């Protein structure tokens, strides 16, 4: 349901580093 960079259906994924 949350994180950064890491799913395919809700909306987060990745984005830096």
Straight-line distance from the first to the last Cα atom of the chain, in angstroms, rounded to the nearest whole number: 20
Burial 1-17 (b: 16+ CB within 10 A, else e): eeeeeeeeeeeeeeeee
- Is the distance from CB of 2 to CB of 11 less than 8 angstroms? no
- Which sign, positive or negative, has the C-alpha torsion 6, 11, 15, 17? negative
- Is the distance from CB of 7 to CB of 15 less than 8 angstroms? no
- Is the distance from CB of 12 to CB of 3 less than 8 angstroms? yes
Method underlying the structure = electron diffraction
Q: In sequence order, which residues have a C-beta less than 8 Å from that of residue 8 and are 6 or more positions away?
A: none
What Å resolution does this PDB entry report?
1.5
3-state SS string for 1-17: CCCCCCCCCCCCCCCCC
3: which 2 tokens? 């994180």
């Amino acid at each position: 349901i949350a994180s950064a960079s890491c799913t395919t259906x809700i909306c987060t994924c990745s984005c830096s580093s």
